[PDB]
Design a binder for this molecule. Structure first.
Ligand SMILES: CCn1cnc2c(NCc3nc4c(F)c(F)ccc4[nH]3)nc(N3CCCC[C@H]3CCO)nc21
Ligand SMILES: [Mg+2]
Lengths: 310, 240
């Protein structure tokens, strides 16, 4: 339990794997155990306000989460000055794989990944945490076919008892839900489920399903597939700040089921429910797990996928 | 799992400061002074009770690992408040903590900060973080006093008086090493118990078991009366 005292020189730094919010992410090796790890650097020097409030939030959250599908911070180490958060090294991330064009995910692979992602998400949500940065690069996968939800840099505690105001510009654009694009600030864990619906769809098409550069363009792309936001499907939409300002081009009908007819029916039901415009009608993480697609997925009985040992 | 942040009275007699020859009375004084300084600085900055208490808990824990002979108390106090502000989402600029400290302390007391007071605090933050082992989340007696007093059913005016007095006792407890000895849930019950005694209130009469003497057993498990008494004595010692 004695964190922060072990030195970083106890690790051999192999190379940079990522850019982090408050420092680089490194692949490294434990000199004593030989184990591969990831090191997330937290730079202190030349910070006006010292140890970053951002890292403080992340550390507070990480220490409260123990779940097999969620990243688990082993210890915090110091320079011989920066600090380094230590995690088990994961062979891949979803983005890299999907971009390698070396992998194809079977329906069985998808079920397994989704089952694990949603179980991790559900765990966080039940702990009253909003992730707020779900995307492919933040979902880690090992060669054993084990998934981990990563990057709690933007996560925050959410008041389930009574509504509170939160930061609106969260989630990378492509995975950002309609309520945020429309300016909601008293949003819910539903924002993360929308992000996951985007991953689900992306797993089937191998391309991000909504690709726009700006918010209005993003809302229009969402509208084109899911239908235009309107009171008929989303009564409370009229209460959102940008509802009149940001209006799609035509009043689109939902053609999600047509566009993704190539997807298996049970996967498609789940996708439909996850990409439901009205956050109050969008399924919860607990509900995804009770869907036809996931309810009978027996993880122990699944073959690992064929991932490169790159 | 998580570090143990509780010590014996035998352990509290063997702090790094006593090992360096600081007598026990002087250490208690240094702690009262450091705690009251965090409370005073923080109050002037409009910080509220949880941030002040977190700052104070970090301060007391720090001195279980370091000596007052090596680490000037007000510098550590300022540093603990600064960190606590970030942890509790009520941040304050280090500049402003220094300015308030300059105003509250005499020239000798403020001498502790050296030539670059802000740098003195910032440099310590790395050490403080390592010392508290990155265990940032801390719960205080306040929330439990409120949660427990809410479940009390009886005369509104007496219950309010019990709580107001108990709250004052929590503020006092922060000056002692009580937070290094007992969990916040137990300190909360002890302050209710002390307030009830001084007010001559029968708290068991406000419960679902008016005939049951150990009214606190619905709030905390297996806490003997001698533990509550001990805590009471320690709080009362501040008034002696
Ligand atoms: C949570 C900390 N943690 C533990 N294992 C990993 C991990 N393993 C997959 C991997 N990817 C690589 C890569 F891209 C390279 F170039 C070289 C080597 C790689 N290894 N990847 C990432 N990141 C992947 C994108 C950068 C940031 C983070 C996102 C989440 O923190 N974080 C990880
Ligand atoms: Mg991020």
């Amino acid at each position: 339990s004695d964190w922060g005292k072990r030195c970083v020189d106890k690790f051999d730094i192999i190379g940079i794997i990522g850019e982090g919010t408050y420092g680089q992410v490194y692949k490294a090796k434990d000199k004593d155990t030989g184990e591969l790890v990831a090191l997330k650097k937290v730079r202190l020097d030349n910070e006006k306000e010292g140890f970053p409030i951002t890292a403080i939030r992340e550390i507070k959250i990480l220490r409260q989460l123990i779940h097999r599908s969620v990243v688990n911070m082993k210890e915090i180490v110091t320079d011989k000055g920066a600090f380094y958060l230590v995690f088990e090294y994961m062979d891949h991330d979803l983005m890299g794989l999907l971009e390698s064009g070396l992998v194809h995910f079977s329906e069985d692979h998808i079920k397994s990944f989704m089952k694990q992602l949603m179980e991790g998400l559900e765990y966080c949500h039940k702990k009253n945490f909003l992730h707020r940065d779900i995307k492919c690069s933040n979902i880690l996968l090992n060669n054993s076919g084990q998934i981990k939800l990563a990057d709690f840099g933007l996560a925050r505690l959410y008041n389930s008892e009574e509504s509170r105001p939160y930061t609106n510009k969260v989630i990378t654009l492509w995975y950002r839900p309609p309520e945020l694009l429309l300016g909601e600030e008293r949003y819910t864990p539903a924002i993360d489920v929308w992000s996951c619906g985007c991953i689900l769809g992306e797993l089937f098409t191998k391309k991000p399903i909504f690709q726009a550069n700006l918010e209005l363009a993003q809302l229009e792309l969402i509208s084109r597939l899911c239908g235009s936001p309107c009171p008929a499907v989303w009564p409370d939409v009229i209460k959102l700040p940008y509802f009149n300002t940001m209006k799609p081009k035509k009043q689109y009908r939902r053609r999600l089921r047509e566009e993704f007819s190539f997807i298996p029916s049970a996967a498609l039901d789940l996708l439909d429910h996850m990409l439901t415009l009205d956050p109050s009608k969008r399924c919860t993480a607990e509900q995804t797990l009770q869907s036809d697609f996931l309810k009978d997925v027996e993880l122990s009985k699944m073959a690992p996928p064929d991932l490169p040992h790159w | 799992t998580k570090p143990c942040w509780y010590w014996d009275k035998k352990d509290l007699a063997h702090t790094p400061s006593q090992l360096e020859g600081l007598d026990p009375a002087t250490e208690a004084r240094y702690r009262r002074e450091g705690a009251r300084f965090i409370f005073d600085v923080g109050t002037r900055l409009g910080l509220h009770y949880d941030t002040l208490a977190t700052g104070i808990i970090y301060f007391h824990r720090f001195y279980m690992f370091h000596s007052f002979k090596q680490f000037p108390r007000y510098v550590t106090g300022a540093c603990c408040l600064f960190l606590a502000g970030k942890v509790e989402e009520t941040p304050k600029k280090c500049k402003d903590i220094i300015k308030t400290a300059r105003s509250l302390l005499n020239d000798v007391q403020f001498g502790q900060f050296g030539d670059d007071p802000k740098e003195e605090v910032m440099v310590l933050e790395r050490i403080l973080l390592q010392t508290i082992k990155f265990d940032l989340q801390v719960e205080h007696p306040y929330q439990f006093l409120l949660k427990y007093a809410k479940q009390l059913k009886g005369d509104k005016n007496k219950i309010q008086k019990l709580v107001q007095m108990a709250w004052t006792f929590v503020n006092d407890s922060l000056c002692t090493t009580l937070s290094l000895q007992w969990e916040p849930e137990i300190i909360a019950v002890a302050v209710m118990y002390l307030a009830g005694r001084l007010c001559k209130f029968e708290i068991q009469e406000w419960t679902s078991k008016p005939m049951y003497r150990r009214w606190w057993e619905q709030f905390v498990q297996d806490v003997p009366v001698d533990v509550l008494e001990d805590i009471c004595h320690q709080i009362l010692d501040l008034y002696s």
